[PDB]
């Protein structure tokens, strides 16, 4: 519903959940948003 966000107030977009090249499938490791 909302992209991930850091809070340094200011409101900063967090880079977590983004797609990457991985040697192992990314769903069994992380949540991909």
């Amino acid at each position: 519903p909302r992209p991930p966000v850091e809070e340094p107030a200011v409101e900063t977009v967090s880079p977590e959940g983004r797609g990457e090249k991985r040697p192992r499938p990314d769903r069994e490791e992380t949540l991909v948003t």
């Binding site: 069994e28 490791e29 992380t30 949540l31």
Partner: peptide, 11 residues
């Protein structure tokens, strides 16, 4: 990373 919980059937 290493904090991601392990895949199990139904939990």
């Amino acid at each position: 990373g290493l904090r991601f919980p392990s895949k199990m059937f139904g939990g």
